[PDB]
């Protein structure tokens, strides 16, 4: 093939232009995103029961739904929680690669077999079923700068004049609002209600009667009498539309003839669906949205498009309204885009300076300046053909292939330039001999480099998806690289290079260009003499190779293995956890303090604080909170003390003075949609009918026995909440019957007043919203306000709860959890420093086996991936060893000559571990994938050294040490040009600081140090291996 | 696809403006478009125009005073003049619906409302005139 | 049965519409509420969208409102068909 | 149409460029293609 295109230089230019057309076409239209879909796909059912205790939500919604979640494909596990805000969240998680669409449908179908069995109050609130494994594209906030709009008002406006437009933008798939649209709110007053002998039942009945949309038919409708001229609709009651209309609802006519109006017993006012979340932005009332990225959509397109949408609307907002953007991925996506290209461009210049230093002409330097572009651009068309996206993982999978894409251009031009200066052939025929010496080896270089990266695309779980991103990007660029080294680069070597005379080693040049050729010719002389002097006692230099193998193995087992490094993303979280019982008002104080501190002590780094008094991550509740700190650009936050980690430490430390509470800051894990990070994830399970209490006691035993082994387990803790005092009102059924009081009237008097009640709908500026009845806070705050409420008996008398009820305080759960349909408590922790997570697990399991009879366990989340993915690495890379072995035996037609190539692996890796352990890095995914590219070039250099030394024996009749010392001479200059352009091209990634430094340093330090050793040592060890093997 | 040629415009109430106002605003555009016949021909709406409607308003205070249920009133009216599906029956061994409606004779003119009575709690028959009142108004036969 | 255009919109259409979000490849949604008591809501999608997957997602979101629709409407059947096809033939039936 | 008006000048532009590269591929020349590429109007004019 190379010869076909040497003589057709335009046909090969046509093909390389089309690879660039198909690959440039592939960049414009392909989805950009920070990552792809790594998390196993989950479906969440969510349901609300206004006014319900955690037990009620579980015993009338959760369990019902759960008991119907079977007969579903690829279901890994199901966890659910039932809190005391009346909310139920059931997450069903599935096998990796399950169809997110098919899973949602099957769930929905089984859910809907229980909908008829759910309470009506729950049905009316909406039992939603979304796809939960995605994560936030951006976050809009909305403030009013005149300060004339409750969060209620702003939320309504956002609900009525923003939310849909954004959710109809091209590429959006989910939008969540930080509030509700307005709700007509009747705030009952019990003093009045008793005055006129009325309960909240009368109110609710009036509202449903006087706020109604009645269908009344038509005058002159089908079927018609003959001779009819009029056809008109009959119109009757229409839903009320104003607080004024609502207040004018007639509840009762007095005996004298006076009217009892709704406004006579309650306070009508537009308000919210619920008041559980106060969301302040820099301590101002706010609303906003939590947008999400659609499956396979261009983050850049969508994100920009919204910003232009909001922009389109800003003229028309009410006075004061201001849109804010306290989070966006778009900057960090443009950053990573900018960072990878500004590393591939400096790699074309660093190969320009490297090529020009040895080959000393600009004609040769234009072939790798042209060759890498093609393989880069055209890998995108091969990734598009396989449905991959432009993501940090695929983008850094292309800077990690530089060593292999650049060697594929150096080995073609250097061998052409070498055959011309040693034999004296013209450019057109020296390329034919140069490319005959590396035709079958390059096809063998690719079949081997397949069997190295491809077994990693078969890894399982979330990890196996991360690996499937590099594995296909690299293999794609490399299969396109080896094809570019057989179509375009020999056509280029044959028409752009000028002749060199036989023997001219540039030793007759003056200036700086004379000195280097005379110092390198002797440097070639001194090296080939070393290899000789090394050959003398190869039995000595095989004993030193075993020190590299125990030094690596010793280094492999002491280097800690992480997942993916934490970046500074301009944003981070602080959690506020007041204790059990703490009113919203208290939690606000602490929250206002968190915002204050961030707006003074860190004014230079802090851009904004989005304070959410209502929900944390332990749960929702009046005692929890989350503050969202958005930092200024990384440009205005220079240094270490002005980057997230530093700021969080300062924070955690500064807040420890807070006495009546728990305030912690921390940083967002890299993959937000997985959290993971490290540690383990334990579930304690009531596998008999034991009970909440007993499961708690049993959870206690484990928590105490775990705190007595701090050597292995640190931070062993629960994730759920602790029992809280509750007020129980017990109805004496016999006393109620005796007085003529309905249990249903009693029950709704109580829950309507203290819990709230959705009654029906109304029209508010021509949109349908809900109407709710609740007591005005005055009479629903203390256990003694129950004496203010009365319930009307059949004889028509008003009766106080004290006449049929009694009360007492008790304890109960504010958050009942269930794991795979059984009661559970989820325990979180981490391995004490030094030990591995896996052995920490075995301790937990041992500890748990001791816990009382009935109490099972299991592992979820992370701990379920690893327990399902630990045996993969030794058996998949075993297959890798075997297939590359069969690829090398295929290239050298020998079951033994492969081994000489197969013995180069440690030489790079040892240096990679070294460079890693020195700097303070970890065995993370960027390390392991950088190892497979470091091994890929150190063995491709061994393939061309063993091919050049076995070709000298096979078709020229040279001896053993002759062919070895002759081949290592030919293959010296290319190994040096490659590894110099690759250590210097990777250098700015090793000294990389600021935005994106986790991913740059994790590839940089592992590739720079593993390339120092895969070139300095290999050159001395790959001739030894070829001799010890060829002689054995 | 229909398509053929021309254009397809949607005028949208992007505040809580109202049916009427959106209509007026639609009118302005339709008139200003008929003053440029050089560019735009046949500029027109696709929906329908407001039609007179008969509104029966129930005096809740008068109904309560007489002991007449709003639900009884409401279904007396809609069952009679609108129709009502009640339940199913078997017709030659297949299940079909059962509907109740007034015979056209008494559901054709606004004056046939005086023929309909609603029974109060005391057990008396009460005409709509004793708790209702009516008037003609305009409304949309097709809200888009 | 028996409803004025306003009633059909304020008790059926808007309810259903307010639940038609979180759906893939949705181009636009138009709907009409007439005085025959009928409601038609057309959701149109990107070209090449899966006619099966689109129907399912709609149905799923529709059904989160079914509990909030009037009983008179539920009993009549809230159907969800694929509307972009066209007539193969038309049979008529007379008695001579 | 508001979502499909820019397509024709840029898609047939790609068409010009790829056939140009196909003709340069057949005659091994970056200039001999143009002699083939200049026949388009001769038919089209008659079609109009």
Numbering used by the authors:
A (entry chain B): 1 to 1032
B (entry chain B): 674 to 817
C (entry chain B): 50 to 145
D (entry chain B): 866 to 913
Please share excerpts from the published article on this structure.
Resistance nodulation and cell division (RND) efflux pumps are secondary active antiporters that are ubiquitous across all domains of life. During drug efflux, AcrB undergoes a functional rotation where each of the three protomers sequentially cycles through the conformational states loose (L), tight (T) and open (O).
In contrast to wildtype AcrB, that crystallises in the LLL and LTO states, the V612F/W crystal structures were exclusively obtained in the TTT state. We thus hypothesised that the substitution impedes the formation of the L state and this in turn might play a role for the transport of L state-binding drugs such as erythromycin. We therefore assumed that the crystallisation conditions might favour the crystal contacts leading to the TTT state for the AcrB variants. F/W612 appears to stabilise an open DBP even in the absence of a substrate, as the bulky side chain might mimic the binding of a small substrate. Moreover, the proximity of the bulky aromatic side chains in the hydrophobic cluster might introduce a steric hindrance for the rearrangements associated with the closing of the DBP required for the O and L state formations. Thus, the stabilisation of the T state DBP in its open form and impaired DBP closing are likely the reason behind the observed increased abundance of the T state on the expense of the L state in the V612F variant.
